[PDB]
Design a protein around this ligand. Structure first.
Ligand SMILES: NC(=O)c1ccc[n+]([C@@H]2O[C@H](COP(=O)([O-])OP(=O)(O)OC[C@H]3O[C@@H](n4cnc5c(N)ncnc54)[C@H](OP(=O)(O)O)[C@@H]3O)[C@@H](O)[C@H]2O)c1
Ligand SMILES: NC(=O)c1ccc[n+]([C@@H]2O[C@H](COP(=O)([O-])OP(=O)(O)OC[C@H]3O[C@@H](n4cnc5c(N)ncnc54)[C@H](OP(=O)(O)O)[C@@H]3O)[C@@H](O)[C@H]2O)c1
Ligand SMILES: COc1ccc(OC(C)(C)C(=O)N[C@@H]2[C@@H]3C[C@@H]4C[C@H]2C[C@@](C(N)=O)(C4)C3)cc1
Ligand SMILES: COc1ccc(OC(C)(C)C(=O)N[C@@H]2[C@@H]3C[C@@H]4C[C@H]2C[C@@](C(N)=O)(C4)C3)cc1
Lengths: 264, 264
């Protein structure tokens, strides 16, 4: 069972932590006395998150600013953050590119950028962070959505990227398992959360309950620290008891001996 | 219920039809006396597929050669094919970039190219083909894998792209449904198929039964023409009765009224 002590002194990276769910996570970690490196593009809002992080009692707090469109930056960032904290225990992958609810017409530029930022940079960051994470037997935490398990209209490019995350990360989990690479991977499936970006975007289009930004953030941190494979968090419990797919876990198992990894 | 007559005189595009499942589909279509435009990179193997297509009694048969890494080409191809057949009734999306079973290490180049070819060009091709497809109330057929519904080790990049397909195309289906855009979308989930590329790649690593290239090709064509949302095709029937996810269909529905499209 979870205890706040678990994060004490741990070295954690949070991406897209200038606002919303990201920022809330940085604050939780600050309260648990962890080492924290935060990132986003806006260095003003990032300075402010760092200050409050030190206030709340973080072991240390730093930021590095830059866009996750830039794959060179994503690689360099992880290294620099590692040197700042002298190692890495948890990689919380949270950022997403500016997106809004719209019918898809011919906006290929958006579909591309969505894969580039929401998915591809998550990979680039994982590659960079893995050596340090093997060292500490750490954790990767990937923030996904209900849109990354079931289909929604108006978030097509977004949904695609969030689906890709499940495919990739659920796949390398199986690789790590048999390679005895001892890094855990948590995929967090979130429903509507009352962040400002969210509430603006869904206003007048979608209607239903939003779950609170603060509790959601903790639920994520909880799941990663307890090395859970998935965290489900939504207002409706009917969702949390239907979003699960035991069929898939069974299939992935019946297939599990039908290949042979020993060769690697 | 299906009948070969349904394809008679229809104008159909098949991608990656120089070999394997692609080529088999082009032959089935030729037998049903359809118009056929095929594509891949290799113009030698493409000439050959065209000849045999004419032989089997295609209403017409042509090829256009070029790489689907090139997004300009994917756009131009659909247009040229449309002019050749004077319209378009079915878009069979089948090609994938060269891939093999391996643990993921740091091959970002591959992950990228995989999204570029296996997913992104599918979108580019859809955008281009949609005006003609609205005209004929046609069909889009998207070739996916069991790896695009459940997680496998050693095909991480591949799985990611095939997951993305489900997310994007399952999403725009819902858009088309309420926009009264009358183009059907078939996602074909395939298990191991005895194509050469497949048999070589899995040899010594994976073990189990492959389903025959020819029957698989027809099952796809069948599903698209009967405007089915999904086709499942695998050796094991235990798969076909476990791969289904009725929970998701239920959730997508309970959510279906909780947003309001009327604004678009
Ligand atoms: N909010 C919800 O109801 C909802 C629902 C389900 C799942 N989620 C998931 O939860 C996560 C966080 O959502 P949120 O609501 O907190 O979003 P948010 O408020 O918009 O925050 C996104 C963060 O990402 C950063 N960012 C945006 N573009 C970037 C770029 N190009 N490069 C680097 N950083 C960038 C932003 O900082 P800068 O713009 O200053 O760079 C910001 O700190 C997302 O992964 C989302 O998929 C959200
Ligand atoms: N085979 C299986 O057991 C298996 C299992 C599940 C799902 N599937 C799915 O079934 C579909 C077909 O599989 P397959 O076994 O027939 O594969 P395949 O034999 O390797 O054929 C792939 C086709 O794509 C073309 N292609 C490759 N790279 C290309 C590029 N960059 N640009 C344009 N065309 C390119 C190839 O022609 P050129 O190389 O000459 O360009 C070839 O015609 C794939 O989408 C795959 O995901 C296959
Ligand atoms: C069509 O009906 C629906 C659409 C969307 C719905 O919320 C989801 C659970 C899918 C979700 O994750 N939405 C996110 C997404 C889209 C938008 C709102 C939210 C924040 C977001 C952002 N932070 O940029 C902007 C990114 C529910 C229902
Ligand atoms: C780890 O155990 C497994 C791995 C892979 C398995 O087959 C799948 C059902 C996932 C699949 O779709 N494989 C495809 C894929 C990988 C390889 C073989 C096949 C053809 C392919 C190609 N045509 O390039 C080359 C593309 C089953 C089991």
């Amino acid at each position: 069972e979870f205890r706040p002590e678990m994060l004490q002194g741990k070295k954690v990276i949070v991406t897209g932590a200038s606002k919303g769910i990201g920022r809330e996570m940085a604050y939780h970690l600050a309260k648990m006395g962890a080492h924290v490196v935060v990132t986003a593009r806006s260095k003003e809002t990032l300075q402010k998150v760092v200050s409050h992080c030190l206030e709340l009692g973080a072991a240390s707090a730093h930021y590095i600013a830059g866009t996750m469109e830039d794959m060179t930056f994503a690689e360099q960032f992880v290294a620099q953050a590692g040197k700042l904290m002298g190692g890495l225990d948890m990689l919380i992958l949270n950022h997403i590119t500016n997106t809004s609810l719209n019918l898809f017409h011919d906006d290929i530029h958006h579909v591309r950028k969505s894969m580039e930022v929401n998915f591809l940079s998550y990979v680039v960051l994982t590659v960079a962070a893995l050596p340090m994470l093997k060292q500490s037997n750490g954790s990767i935490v990937v923030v996904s959505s209900l849109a990354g398990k079931v289909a929604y209209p108006m978030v097509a490019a977004y949904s695609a990227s969030k689906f890709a995350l499940d495919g990739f990360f659920s796949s390398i989990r199986k690789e790590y398992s048999v390679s005895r690479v001892n890094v855990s991977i948590t995929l967090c499936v979130l429903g509507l959360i009352d962040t400002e970006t969210a509430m603006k975007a869904v206003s007048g289009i979608v209607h239903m309950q939003a779950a609170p930004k603060e509790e959601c953030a903790l639920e994520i941190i909880k799941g990663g620290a307890l090395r859970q494979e998935e965290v489900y968090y939504d207002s409706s419990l009917w969702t949390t008891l239907l979003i699960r797919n035991p069929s898939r876990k069974i299939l992935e198992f019946l297939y599990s001996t039908s290949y042979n990894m020993d060769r690697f």
